[PDB]
């Protein structure tokens, strides 16, 4: 295979500003209650400063980015708060989990509630006040009556209500006397007591019911530099009533909350603290601050309520802006997003015993596509679509000609205010389709000269887009769940070729059997939105694949008498175990007129479907998940995509690159280790002691090891039915592997994206905190 390493695609990193998990803590259950906690959908929301709200799935240590909802130009995201209802019980003893909703603020006077199913904003709410800077939900004591409390710039604690899926501005609790008092943080002590952190060196404790002012904790000046006000950038509340507070001196102040006074000041960071996180029981404090520095705090032995800094470390690369913790289903993690666009997860209960993990800052969708016939590669971000031509092969180059070999060909600019959600291209590059969350537009390309081929009947936008390899069918996924398809008739004329798309002819999806308590509880029909859409090589067969593991296909029946109809084996095609992370058809056709549908899902689970036969291919009968190679079973990285050759399929995650020979069959990390949701165990340099040995028998020869704690016949039948795999890691920040032409030989564009200090925003330093 032939590779072009490409680093000139400047994907603009966005500073991550907020994270929020669905649940803060799940109740501890043993092994005989795993059925009591299987069906709960914990999701992690991340808001980047380009208005980018993303949902990830922890996957017991999988960390797969499900959904990207982008906002328009000049829109940012400050706060993210999930609200989760208590566990309601059915009439027959079945359990209904809470219905979780997502709220966000955008440096506006507005709170926006996002519809996670529709993959867009649901409602806006605006009261007459300042622009909101911080907000939080009243926790449970009542049950049906929980309220958002938002502190803003002018000071006035506004109070919003959320009942029966409604978001309206209820009232204003108070406002501080001074107008220059700005509210920068908020966290709740109990059901009726709110703790707000205020930029006049103040931490006010208000009471929600009468809207009164219980007390006003204060802090002195900062004596490190000028700017005589300190600023309490974050507060949080321990379970035993005490309040932790990160401030602008790089301190952390522990306030006892029975009297609202300070009981400890701990100097850790050099510049200002930006975010905190608490353990679920209240033993560990995580403090992330603008010295790109994260510190871990534990109680001192002996006296009560007294904390001290165990250890600190520079995890990120820019200032650590936000973090949120989670402790449930045998996974104790805290995720911290900074300004380097890369969320780092850290194990909580085993912190210092297991490594952290930097999730990929590049998006999970490959976001790079190519028309291999025209040698066009293409990428997109906020409102522009960039197209490069390559003009040559590489056999010719097997030094001074490569600058001219690559070529910045085209930049398509999109009008309006929305952002490009998805894009796709024909094989010859003449037909480009781009979908915002409000529209979808076609561009005809001429070798440049671009024209806007108009869609009609849309106006609701779409989340996914694919084009037929014979350039006759534009299929898109509108509103997430509603898949629509459209014929395009290509009409020739003396000037050239023209294209006209018909009205969208909607095709219906299968009614799966799903219980009503599952449909209602959790997130509802959130996983119904389809993640990948894929044609066959001859555009006779389409398929879509959702977030749940259902893969629904369609077959084209002709006489334009062509129409897409449901495949009769689609009921036979089963639900996968998890989200299908990559799904495409084989380019090399079979012998029976059927197809080979290669589908890999986030548990590294590979398979190949015979869709018209509705069962697994015989290769897939032969090669079960325990027969995959170990360097593919322990990658800890979701495979971003695949590229095709005859019998070799190459896979690429974010850091890895594999090839598998589909023809043949097959013959470090430890499997049995029970770890947290982040990485493996330390082997060399850890603060915790590894080999604790007890010594009886004073002669020193009898020691003891003290542990530190708190289908056989199916394979017979399959072989009665009767290598080449190569891995590498030497392409580290892979964002796009895209094949080009011009076991067969094949060129490819490997578009990487390593970050750099010219790609991050700028640091800032006073006279006292110069780094080394």
């Amino acid at each position: 295979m032939d590779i072009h390493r490409c680093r000139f695609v400047r994907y603009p990193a966005s500073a991550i500003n907020a994270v929020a998990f669905t649940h803060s803590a799940l109740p501890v259950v043993s092994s005989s209650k795993k059925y009591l906690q299987k069906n709960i959908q914990v999701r992690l929301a991340i808001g980047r400063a380009n208005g980018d709200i993303e949902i990830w799935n922890p996957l017991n240590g999988g960390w797969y980015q499900e959904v990207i909802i982008p906002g328009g130009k000049d829109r940012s995201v400050d706060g993210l708060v999930w609200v989760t209802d208590p566990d309601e019980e059915m009439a027959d003893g079945k359990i209904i989990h809470g219905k979780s909703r997502l709220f966000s603020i955008g440096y506006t006077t507005t709170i926006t509630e996002w519809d996670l199913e529709k993959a867009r904003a649901k409602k806006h709410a605006s009261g007459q006040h300042g622009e909101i800077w911080c907000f939080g939900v009243q926790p449970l004591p009542a049950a049906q009556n929980r309220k958002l409390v938002a502190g803003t710039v002018d000071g006035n604690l506004v109070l919003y209500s959320i009942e029966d899926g409604d978001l309206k501005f209820q009232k204003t609790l108070t406002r501080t006397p001074s107008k220059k008092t700005k509210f920068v943080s908020i966290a709740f002590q109990s059901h009726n007591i709110v703790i707000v952190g205020c930029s006049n060196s103040t931490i006010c404790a208000y009471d929600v019911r009468t809207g009164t002012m219980l007390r006003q904790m204060t802090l002195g000046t900062d004596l490190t530099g000028g700017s005589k006000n300190i600023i309490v950038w974050a507060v949080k509340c321990l379970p035993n009533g005490d309040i932790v507070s990160g401030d602008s001196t790089g301190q952390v102040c522990i306030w006892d909350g029975k009297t609202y006074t300070q009981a400890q000041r701990i100097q850790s960071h050099t510049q200002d603290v930006l975010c905190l996180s608490v353990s679920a029981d209240g033993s560990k404090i995580i403090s992330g601050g603008m010295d790109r520095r994260t510190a871990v705090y534990e109680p001192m032995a002996g006296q009560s309520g007294r904390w001290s800094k165990v250890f600190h470390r520079r995890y990120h690369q820019h200032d650590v802006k936000a973090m949120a913790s989670f402790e449930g289903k045998g996974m104790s993690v805290v995720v911290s997003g900074g300004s380097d666009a890369s969320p780092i997860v850290l194990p909580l209960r085993a912190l210092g015993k297991e490594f952290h993990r930097t999730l990929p800052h590049l998006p999970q969708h490959p976001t790079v596509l190519s028309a291999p016939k025209a040698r066009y590669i293409l990428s997109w971000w906020e409102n522009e679509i960039r197209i490069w031509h390559l003009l040559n092969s590489a056999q010719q180059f097997l030094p001074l000609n490569l600058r001219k070999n690559r070529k910045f060909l085209a930049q398509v600019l999109i009008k309006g205010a929305s952002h490009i959600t998805s894009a796709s291209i024909s094989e010859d590059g003449t037909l480009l389709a781009a979908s915002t969350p409000t529209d979808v537009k076609v561009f005809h390309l001429d070798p440049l000269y671009i024209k806007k081929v108009n869609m009609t009947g849309t106006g609701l936008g779409a989340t996914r887009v694919q084009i037929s390899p014979d350039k006759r069918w534009i299929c898109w996924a509108e509103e997430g769940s509603k898949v629509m398809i459209s014929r395009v008739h290509a009409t020739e004329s003396a000037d050239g070729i023209s294209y006209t798309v018909s009205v969208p002819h909607k095709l219906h999806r299968l009614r799966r059997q799903i219980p009503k308590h599952i449909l209602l509880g959790g997130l509802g029909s959130y996983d119904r939105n389809v993640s990948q859409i894929a044609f066959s090589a001859d555009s006779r067969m389409l398929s879509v694949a959702d977030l749940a593991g259902y893969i629904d296909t369609w077959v084209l029946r002709g006489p334009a008498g062509e129409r897409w109809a449901r495949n009769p084996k689609a009921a036979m095609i089963p639900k996968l175990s998890a989200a299908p992370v990559v799904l495409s058809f084989s380019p090399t056709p079979r012998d029976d007129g059927d197809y080979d549908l290669l589908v890999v899902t986030t548990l590294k689970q590979l398979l190949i479907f015979n869709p018209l036969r509705g069962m697994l291919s015989e290769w897939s009968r032969r090669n079960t998940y325990p027969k995959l190679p170990e360097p593919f079973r322990d990658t800890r990285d979701q495979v971003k995509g695949i590229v095709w050759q005859g019998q070799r399929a190459w896979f690429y995650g974010v850091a890895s690159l594999f090839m598998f020979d589909l023809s043949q069959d097959f013959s470090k990390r430890k499997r049995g280790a029970h770890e947290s949701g982040a990485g493996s165990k330390i082997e060399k340099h850890s603060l915790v002691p590894q080999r604790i040995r007890a010594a009886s028998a004073p002669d020193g020869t009898k020691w003891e090891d003290i542990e530190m704690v708190d289908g056989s016949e199916l394979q017979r039948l399959r072989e009665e039915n009767r290598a080449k795999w190569w891995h590498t890691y030497q392409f580290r920040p892979i964002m796009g592997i895209v094949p080009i032409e011009g076991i067969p030989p094949l060129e490819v564009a490997l578009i990487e994206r390593p970050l750099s200090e010219d790609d991050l925003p700028e640091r800032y330093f006073a006279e006292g905190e110069w780094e080394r």
Binding site: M1, D2, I3, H4, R5, C6, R7, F8, A394, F397, L398, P399, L400, L402, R403, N405, R406, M659, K724, W726, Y729, Q730, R732, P733, L750, P754
Partner: protein
């Protein structure tokens, strides 16, 4: 004028010698930044091999980790590069064929 050209020929000799080492290494496939054309590069510089030893704080030395070596190699790599893999590579025997854009 003898001491003039003594200085000149000394600096060009030492650059050609570092170039001998660097060309042998680029032939082996260590993938450093090598010049190709017949004129001199302006700064008479080459990229030496990345040492197997690092400097920790405050003054101790430890053996480099292959992870960090790969990090520095990906740093040293340029913008555009053709990196052809062969069947001997997929078998596990030989190395790749690399040409990077001459920065």
């Amino acid at each position: 004028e003898a001491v003039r050209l003594k200085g000149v020929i000394a600096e060009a000799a030492n650059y050609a010698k570092r170039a001998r080492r660097a060309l042998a290494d680029s032939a082996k496939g260590k993938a450093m930044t090598v010049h190709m054309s017949a004129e001199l590069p302006l700064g008479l510089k080459t990229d030496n091999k990345i040492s197997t030893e690092r400097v920790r704080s405050g003054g101790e030395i430890v053996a480099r980790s292959s992870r960090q070596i790969g990090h520095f190699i990906s740093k040293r790599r340029g913008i555009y590069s053709i990196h052809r893999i062969s069947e001997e590579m997929l078998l596990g025997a030989a190395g790749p064929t690399v040409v990077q854009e001459a920065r």
